[PDB]
């Protein structure tokens, strides 16, 4: 598909698509780069995650709009407007599931299995938790518990490695904790675990800031502020 383009050209075009805010193109260029079979560098893993996080973030936001319309349409006293809202929410839902399945597929074939370094392994397992969590946001049927547990299992293995192999200030460790905390709060119905995790993560990072350069400090404090934003919202 992107099979005939050079890996380096795909990478270069992903960067151009990012500059152009063309995230669907960005994601397809990065998908092509992953399918070349070589491991991704730090920079390239970042492009991969930014492309999909934007594509799926757009589909999730639209799904939420449509879901909220569909819920109002189902309230007592609501005029029957036919199947259209549910159909079009399903259409957006299907496309979003397809994007999650695409990313999960890239992680399983074969990014995770070849990722030996903590910074690559934790990154990819965080993505695995994130995309199962997006599937969980829309899941309503037989598989919901297993989708939730898949998100949990991926975040958990990422947390276990990151606690062993990464400093408490590492941005990947902080972003993973941020998202796993959101998973607990809104997917797993465990707001206490979500709060505890955000708090402990924030405090352990505070105590390690002193080891950092000014640039590392700014990187870590950026995501710490997201932890604090959630603690503020939730407490």
């Amino acid at each position: 598909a992107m099979g005939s383009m050079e890996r380096a050209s795909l990478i270069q075009k992903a960067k151009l698509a990012e500059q152009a805010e063309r995230y669907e193109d960005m994601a397809a260029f990065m998908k092509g780069a992953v399918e070349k079979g070589e491991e991704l560098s730090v920079e390239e893993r970042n492009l991969l995650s930014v492309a999909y996080k934007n594509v799926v973030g757009g589909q999730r936001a639209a799904w939420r709009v449509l879901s909220s319309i569909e819920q109002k349409s189902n309230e007592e006293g609501s005029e029957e407007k036919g199947p259209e809202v549910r159909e079009y929410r399903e259409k957006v839902e299907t496309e979003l599931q397809g994007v999650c399945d695409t990313v999960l597929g890239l992680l399983d074939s074969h990014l995770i299995k070849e990722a030996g370094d903590a910074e690559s392994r934790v990154f990819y397992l965080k993505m695995k938790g994130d995309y199962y969590r997006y599937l969980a946001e829309v899941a309503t049927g037989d598989d919901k518990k297993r989708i939730i547990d898949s998100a949990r299992s991926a975040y958990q293995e990422a947390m276990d490695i990151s606690k062993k192999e990464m400093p408490p200030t590492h941005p990947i460790r902080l972003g993973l904790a941020l998202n796993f905390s959101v998973f607990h709060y809104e997917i797993a119905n465990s707001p206490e675990e979500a709060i505890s995790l955000a708090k402990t993560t924030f405090d352990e990072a505070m105590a390690d800031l002193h080891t950092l350069s000014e640039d590392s400090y700014k990187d870590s404090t950026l995501i710490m502020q997201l932890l604090r934003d959630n603690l503020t919202l939730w407490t």
Binding site: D130, L178, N179, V182, I223, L226, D229, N230, L233, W234
Partner: peptide, 6 residues
């Protein structure tokens, strides 16, 4: 507003 993720 909306909780943060990254």
């Amino acid at each position: 507003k909306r909780r943060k993720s990254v």
